[PDB]
Symmetry: C2
């Protein structure tokens, strides 16, 4: 349970975030973040940096969002990064065919006048929804007679709609491009520079914290389905012969909710497991994937996501290996962090397309295309050299993948530098062995969707007080609260301000983010306002603080609203240790006088 309406009202009112271009009617899937929201987001990102980039000594890079077409063609985004879309024929309103058909089905299955066998049929359709191609989906649309859910009219046949934002780089029409749909490709393109930076050694990891774009058909669902979004993505390159993480024992004792592919197939439920046990039993393939899963868990819980509403779902054979961190919200289980485990065929693709060897290189202890120069020479004269040097760099996965088509269809076609070439029995294969080893690195890909993580934290930390007027507050951990300490002085009189100034300065010296409250009203109402945005602690300075000696102020805990009274010069250290988790509120109450004034 979560009062989404009330929470959303608080989020819009205190301006954590709001619909972008609101005064222009707004734009779907686009959101502006306000001061408090920006503070929270910056805290999220900083905590993320110190977690991952700092603990793992990750190589951070910042690539461009603007990406020329060939780069995203080579990566398969031009051909495969799309959603099936259907159009109303009367007005033309676009719909994502997936969720539309799914809606129609989930509706019909839940109808009294419907047979058991058909309900079965439809369960069968849903549990295979992602395998369906264009024609299959068209047939499915016809056979279930799917109409528009607003107008009830007929729908155009499903057609592939690419989700990348299209544009043009330069003033001609010769460099068409896209806004990047992910930040991984920029890391892959810089793989050589990064490997060099790491003195040629494996393993290593690169990270990027920046925006990505996705021309979502019809965004609803708030922050969950957006068109422009900030991602925190790690690419961990490891030797496939070295799938063992030296630091796995640090997270091996963690107890996580795991939702295996087998459990999903067999209608089973997720189960709590020790991470080490899960790896030991082959639920999680290796300890690199396991390690990163564990630290993803630790990060998510650190920023305020509830453990009882957090699970890790493995991807089924139709969605290589991939575990997603999923949180339970009012929109149901949503993916917030992806974590792929796979051979980096990306490096191979870009290597072929650019003729630049993107490969690791390990020395050992001293343990193929066979073209016809003549036929290619006659076919493509001066361009034969290019076909040749293309072929001389292709890796075994590709020599295989094209050997198949060389057999079956008796062809297989490439494209290099300029354009394309149809190779047909101008080729052959070579064998034997010899010999430094070429290492095509496996990659673990943790992909953090900061917006969804933030919204999850919103839903998991939102609470209401007891009163007739339902005062709301956010149980933000101090590490991500917009700021940690509110300083509430009673007056502006120039004998108060020295205390306020000293308190602020000391708070800054102690690394406690704070803010002096110059707001209007009763103490409890001001504290209600600061609670409303999830500020963790409060220090109120009254007349007794100023005029009586020793000078003591009141420390108030956000969650409990309970207070103590302490020497104002000691409060920065207390708030520091509180926020850093060095001491509990109970530890503070046990050493300082209680205070309900």
């Amino acid at each position: 349970i979560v009062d989404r309406a009330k929470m959303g009202d608080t989020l819009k009112r205190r301006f954590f975030y709001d619909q972008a271009f609101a005064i222009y009617g707004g734009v779907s899937g686009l959101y502006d973040f306000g001061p408090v929201g920006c503070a929270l987001k910056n805290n999220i990102i900083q905590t993320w940096r110190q977690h991952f980039i700092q603990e793992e000594q990750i190589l951070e890079i910042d690539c461009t969002m603007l990406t020329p077409e060939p780069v995203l063609k080579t990566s398969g985004h031009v051909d495969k990064f799309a959603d099936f879309m259907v159009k109303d024929v009367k007005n033309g309103e676009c719909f994502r065919a997936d969720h539309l058909l799914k809606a129609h089905l989930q509706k019909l299955m839940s109808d009294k006048k419907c047979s058991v066998e058909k309900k079965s049929e439809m369960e069968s359709v849903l549990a295979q929804l992602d395998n369906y191609g264009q024609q299959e989906l068209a047939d499915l649309f016809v056979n279930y007679n799917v109409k528009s859910p607003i107008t009830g009219n007929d729908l155009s046949p499903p057609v592939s709609f690419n989700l990348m934002f299209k544009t043009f780089i330069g003033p001609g029409g010769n460099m068409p491009g896209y806004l990047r749909p992910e930040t991984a490709q920029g890391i892959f393109l810089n793989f050589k520079r990064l490997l060099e930076f790491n003195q040629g050694k494996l393993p290593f990891a690169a990270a990027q914290i920046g925006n990505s774009f996705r021309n979502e058909i019809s965004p609803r669902s708030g922050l969950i389905r957006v068109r422009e979004f900030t991602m925190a993505e790690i690419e961990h390159f490891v030797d496939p012969s070295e799938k063992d993480h030296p630091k796995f024992q640090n997270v091996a004792d963690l107890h996580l909710y795991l939702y295996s592919a087998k459990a999903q197939v067999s209608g089973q439920s997720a189960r709590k497991m020790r991470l080490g046990d899960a790896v030991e039993q082959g639920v999680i393939n290796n300890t690199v994937l396991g390690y990163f899963i564990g630290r993803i868990y630790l990060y998510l819980t650190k920023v305020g996501i509830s453990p009882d509403k957090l699970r890790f779902r493995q991807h089924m054979e139709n969605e290589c290996d991939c575990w997603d961190a999923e949180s339970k919200t009012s929109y149901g289980w949503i993916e917030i962090v992806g974590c792929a485990d796979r051979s980096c065929y990306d490096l191979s693709c870009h290597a072929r397309a650019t003729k630049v060897p993107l490969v690791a290189e390990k020395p050992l202890k001293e343990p193929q295309f066979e073209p016809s120069k003549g036929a290619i020479g006659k076919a493509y004269k001066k361009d034969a050299k290019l076909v040749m040097e293309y072929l001389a760099i292709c890796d075994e996965c590709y020599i295989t993948e094209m050997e198949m088509l060389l057999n079956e269809k008796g062809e297989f076609t490439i494209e290099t530098e300029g354009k394309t070439f149809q190779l047909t029995k101008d080729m052959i294969n070579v064998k034997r062995f010899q010999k430094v080893e070429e290492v095509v690195p496996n990659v673990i890909e943790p992909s953090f969707g900061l917006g969804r993580i933030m919204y999850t934290v919103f839903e998991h930390t939102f609470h209401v007080r007891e009163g007739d007027e339902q005062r709301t507050f956010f149980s933000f951990p101090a590490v991500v609260a917009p700021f940690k300490c509110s300083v509430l002085p009673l007056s502006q009189n120039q004998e108060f301000m020295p205390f306020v100034k000293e308190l602020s300065e000391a708070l800054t010296r102690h690394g406690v983010s704070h803010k002096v409250d110059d707001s209007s009203g009763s103490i409890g109402r001001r504290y209600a306002r600061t609670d409303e945005i999830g500020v963790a602690f409060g220090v109120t300075i009254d007349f007794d603080t100023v005029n009586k000696t020793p000078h003591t102020a009141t420390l108030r805990d956000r969650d409990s609203m309970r207070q103590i009274r302490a020497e104002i010069s000691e409060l920065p250290s207390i708030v520091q240790d509180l926020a850093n988790g060095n001491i509990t509120w109970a530890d503070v109450e046990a050493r300082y006088p209680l205070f309900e004034g």
Copy 2:
């Protein structure tokens, strides 16, 4: 002087930044930043936050880059954000007409067989280059017979080329949009939310730190002319009746190089002035603009930009009021920080286009369109209401601006909600006075181009050592150096590592960013490597550090390469105070034994 080639080699080699998509041949005006470059950039941004956002309690927001067309139409970017472009007729290579004509002229002026009077004529042409319209520029191209500078062929007549990146939001063709060319508009659209957040009071300031885009015709000049760039932009809203900054005396004593518009016109040189004097004499209009100029200076010098290569150039009548922070580089004087001072007509424009009143409101102490309902009613029937309510919200600047056209051409045309309306003598004017005051805020607009600032710091801090091999280093201030302290241990032996670990942990407790050097070679060569990226301090731990008691390590200053020897437990505090400017290197040498071993 600056060895740009050598410096660029160091920048590319250590991967501060490099051409984006290099393996794909690269893309002009697009750059990826590597680990060291990302560290420097993050330090730049953090220092900027603490300077401006922290010192001024600025309201930070994060708006979207994706912007629908109407927003940028209302702001005048669709019609006016463009460069004049000429095309080669043979190949079609595009050129920015400005710099091309300027190049041709600057060439011809510098020719022996050229008359004095024509040189004068051309000086006259250049000193008016920005006033020329399309036809004028075409005539200028014909009359100076400008050809392609590569092929020598004829050039197409100059044509307006808009610099915004075009795209489409959603799956239709009904929401055409752009990548934002600036971040100010997102602040203007949220003006109401931000004013509310500030409890309705003026003055206040909003900030944004994020990317903007500019489809530059033909980028050369490295980081200086880019298509995608990170900006740090502040919008300071102030009551025009309150053009006085309460904190101006903090910067009033600063001595700045000021390049007035008058000095530029009269062929005069820039001159050093006390800021307060400059304001007093009307060189700088007010103390808000003056204050922000002073703190811009302070920020730029703080991050390593040389004062002797930093000036503030006022904008001439053809470029309201605007001072730009300019730095002297190998590309000459480049603009790195803009600082506009003007009435916010933007708010008025968006107010009219959206019918949403974006205005401040101050209570005092108790001191127009006159349409013809009938004529408009007959002209536009049901749409008369919309014309009406549009007219009821227009501000005096616009009632004036359209009164003029109402006279001259006897027309004037608007556009609201749906589309356009031609008003022709369906209107009139109303007068008198009465009466809370509507405040249309003046704005000071500091716009920081982080890329250019960073490159400037590169050129101003790059130096070479004396040796035959020219070892290079960067005199980065500790506050922006990639990291402050390199820890150089001699061995990996498990009696060294406790010292290294304790030193690292203590360094972290003291807020000193550091890195343990596990590199390959002599001490001096490792320190050469760390100097090469501008690391400010070094702590070398040798065998005498480990095995002899008390345990002392060596502290090495980057610039001087001079060293001292101190108790390894005291070094974190010393490095902290050094980096924070609390003590000098001389202060350290005066208290600890020298060390040239």
